[PDB]
Every structure is written in structure tokens, then in C-alpha cells.
């Protein structure tokens, strides 16, 4: 229905707020843009399926989210891949970790002050019937 289709377009407008408020945050711009290949040849060997805010933002646009649970995902395997990747004791693993932790938790509070827990469960009954 149009209705629906209303409900869809808010998540997006929801969810593009939420990722350039983390996107601008200076503790996070390692993990604005993909891993460049040239600098770190043994990245895409180690991780799987890398994630970055600026493919998150050229997801929503896509329309490959239909629930918030849906993106949070994404935020866990931004969040997931930094600490299998730089798993180590010094300082600058130490450091990439603390703000990935930080990146997670950071979504999650907006999200619990932010979204209407009414508002989640219609798009996720919308996309159960589809
Ligand atoms: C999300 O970002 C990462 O996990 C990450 C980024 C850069 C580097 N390494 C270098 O810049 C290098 F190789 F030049 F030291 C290691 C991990």
C-alpha cells in the first residue's frame, strides 16, 4: 500500500540521520570509507564482508532496509570486523577497538532514545507479510 510505502520512507529518513551523526564524529572517521586495498593488501583475505558508514548510507538509498534491526546488523559487522582484524595487545589495536565498541554502543543509545519501539514492529509485521 502507499501507506507502506510512507512507513518504509521514514525508516530511510530515520536511519540517514542517525548514520551522518555517527559519520561526523571525529573518533570515527576510520570507519567512514572501505579499507583501501593498496594500503592493506591483506585486508579482504582476513575479512569476509567488509562495511563501512559510506556503503550503509549507498544501502538505505538502495532500499535494503526494512527494519532497524536490519541496519543494526550492518553497525555489528562494522563493529565485528575491527575487532577480528586488530585483535592485538598495542596501543594502536587497542585504540581502533575501543572505538568500534564506541560506534556500537553509540548507535544503540540513539536508537533507544530515538526510535518508537510502535514504530519498529510495524515494519518489521510489513516486511513478515511480504
Ligand atoms: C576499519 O579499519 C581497520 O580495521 C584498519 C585500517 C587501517 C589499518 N592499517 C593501516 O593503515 C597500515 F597497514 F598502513 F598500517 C588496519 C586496520
Not at 67 to 92: F, H, Q
Given at each position: 500500500?502507499?501507506?507502506?510505502?510512507?512507513?518504509?520512507?521514514?525508516?530511510?529518513?530515520?536511519?540517514?540521520?542517525?548514520?551522518?551523526?555517527?559519520?561526523?564524529?571525529?573518533?570515527?572517521?576510520?570507519?567512514?570509507?572501505?579499507?583501501?586495498?593498496?594500503?592493506?593488501?591483506?585486508?579482504?583475505?582476513?575479512?569476509?564482508?567488509?562495511?563501512?558508514?559510506?556503503?550503509?548510507i549507498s544501502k538505505?538509498?538502495?532500499?535494503?532496509?526494512?527494519?532497524?534491526?536490519?541496519?543494526?546488523?550492518?553497525?555489528?559487522?562494522?563493529?565485528?570486523?575491527?575487532?577480528?582484524?586488530?585483535?592485538?595487545?598495542?596501543?594502536?589495536?587497542?585504540?581502533?577497538?575501543?572505538?568500534?565498541?564506541?560506534?556500537?554502543?553509540?548507535?544503540?543509545?540513539?536508537?533507544?532514545?530515538?526510535?518508537?519501539?510502535?514504530?519498529?514492529?510495524?515494519?518489521?509485521?510489513?516486511?513478515?507479510?511480504?
Open positions: 500500500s502507499m501507506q507502506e510505502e510512507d512507513t518504509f520512507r521514514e525508516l530511510r529518513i530515520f536511519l540517514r540521520n542517525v548514520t551522518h551523526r555517527l559519520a561526523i564524529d571525529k573518533r570515527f572517521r576510520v570507519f567512514t570509507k572501505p579499507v583501501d586495498p593498496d594500503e592493506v593488501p591483506d585486508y579482504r583475505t582476513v575479512i569476509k564482508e567488509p562495511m563501512d558508514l559510506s556503503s550503509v538505505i538509498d538502495l532500499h535494503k532496509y526494512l527494519t532497524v534491526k536490519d541496519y543494526l546488523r550492518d553497525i555489528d559487522l562494522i563493529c565485528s570486523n575491527a575487532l577480528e582484524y586488530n585483535p592485538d595487545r598495542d596501543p594502536g589495536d587497542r585504540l581502533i577497538r575501543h572505538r568500534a565498541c564506541a560506534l556500537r554502543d553509540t548507535a544503540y543509545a540513539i536508537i533507544k532514545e530515538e526510535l518508537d519501539e510502535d514504530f519498529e514492529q510495524l515494519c518489521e509485521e510489513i516486511q513478515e507479510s511480504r
